Curated annotation (Swiss-Prot), chain A:
Coiled-coil segments on the chain, per record: 4-59
Gene that encodes it: sfr1
Residues of the full protein shown: 181 to 299 of 299
Source species of the chain: Schizosaccharomyces pombe (strain 972 / ATCC 24843)
UniProt function note: Involved in DNA recombination repair and meiotic chromosome segregation.
Record text on subunit structure and interactions: Interacts with swi5 and rhp51.
Compartment list: Cytoplasm; Nucleus
Phylogenetic classification of the source organism: Eukaryota, Fungi, Dikarya, Ascomycota, Taphrinomycotina
Family the entry assigns: Belongs to the SFR1/MEI5 family.
Name listed for the protein in its UniProt record: Swi5-dependent recombination DNA repair protein 1
UniProtKB/Swiss-Prot annotation, chain B:
A Pfam family: Swi5
Species this chain originates from: Schizosaccharomyces pombe (strain 972 / ATCC 24843) (Fission yeast)
GO terms of molecular function: ATPase activator activity; identical protein binding
One GO cellular component, as annotated: mating-type region heterochromatin
Positions of disulphide bridges: none
Entry keyword DNA damage: yes
InterPro entries the record matches: DNA-repair_Swi5
GN (gene name): swi5
Keywords: DNA damage, DNA repair
Function recorded in the entry: Required for normal mating-type switching. Also involved in the rhp51-dependent recombination DNA repair pathway.
Identification of the protein by name: Mating-type switching protein swi5
SUBUNIT field: Interacts with sfr1 and rhp51 during DNA repair. Interacts with swi2 and rhp51 during mating-type switching.
Any single GO BP term: DNA strand invasion
Family to which this protein belongs: Belongs to the SWI5/SAE3 family.
Length: 122, 85
């Protein structure tokens, strides 16, 4: 027969690909270690994070007030049930830091405001 | 493919695999930390975060600079940064 050989070819081919991938990873690690910049990067992240937060607080406050002096924020959705089916349901509410950060494309996980406690998160 | 020929391909794969295990051991030996995947991933996540937050910070500082009618660099001190960062 030859099916044992065919099955072993496929297993060896998988093992070879896996080892090729580990080899690249081990080569990249060598360069990452040589650059040795993880500490720089952590330091720099806190500096720029501190900057973004401070700048966000400067921009947000008068933005929130301008918005408030023209109706504030409208939240809208369509009504799906009942005698009013079709109409859009509206509301008004204050402009929050989180709407601001979303408006600035800031992923929640990068930079977030604790809207309850009224300060920035770790 | 004859069985013979298939045996030859299988034996070449065996030798390829052996050589790769040997090359991988040599590559890992050059590392302070043998967990190369952790090293590379930790670096990738830091670079990701750094590029993102510096971009965002520069964007916001630029908007503050627009309201103050000045070049962004003039506000870097107020925000605790400089241009080599």
């Amino acid at each position: 027969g030859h099916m044992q050989l065919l099955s072993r070819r496929l297993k060896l081919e998988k093992e070879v690909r896996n080892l090729q991938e580990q080899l690249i990873t081990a080569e990249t690690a060598r360069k990452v270690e040589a650059k040795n910049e993880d500490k720089d990067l952590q330091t720099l992240i806190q500096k720029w994070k501190n900057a973004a937060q401070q700048a966000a607080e400067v921009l947000f406050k008068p933005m929130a007030e301008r918005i408030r002096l023209a109706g504030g924020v409208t939240q809208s959705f369509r009504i799906e049930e009942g005698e009013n089916k079709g109409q859009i349901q509206e509301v008004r509410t204050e402009f929050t830091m989180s709407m601001f950060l979303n408006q600035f494309g800031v992923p929640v996980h990068l930079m977030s405001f604790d809207e309850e406690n009224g300060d920035w998160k770790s | 493919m004859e069985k013979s020929q298939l045996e030859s391909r299988v034996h070449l794969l065996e030798q390829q695999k052996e050589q790769l295990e040997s090359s991988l051991q040599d590559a890992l030996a050059k590392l302070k930390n043998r967990d190369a995947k952790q090293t590379v991933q930790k670096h990738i996540d830091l670079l990701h975060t750094y590029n993102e937050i510096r971009d965002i910070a520069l964007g916001m500082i630029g908007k503050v600079a627009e309201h103050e009618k000045c070049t962004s660099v003039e506000l870097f001190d107020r925000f605790g940064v400089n241009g080599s960062e």
